[PDB]
Amino acid sequence: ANDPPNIPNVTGPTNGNIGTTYNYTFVTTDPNGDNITYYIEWGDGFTEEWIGPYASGEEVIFSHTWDKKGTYVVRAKAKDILNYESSWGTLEVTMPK
Burial of 69 (0-12, 13-18, 19+ CB in 10 A): exposed
Instruction: Single out the segment in contact with Ca ion by CB under 5 A; choices: 3-11, 20-28, 41-49, 59-67.
Output: 3-11
Q: Which of 7, 19, 12, 18 shows the shortest CA–CA distance to 84?
A: 7
Cα angle 71-75-76, degrees, rounded to a multiple of 5: 160
How many residues bind to Ca ion according to rule CB under 5 A?
6
Interface with Ca ion in residues 41-70 (CB under 5 A): none
Could you say which of 26, 27, 28, 30 contacts Ca ion (CB under 5 A)?
30
**Residue 32, interface with Ca ion (CB under 5 A)?**
yes
Question: Which residues form the interface with Ca ion (CB under 5 A)?
Answer: 2-3, 30, 32, 34, 80
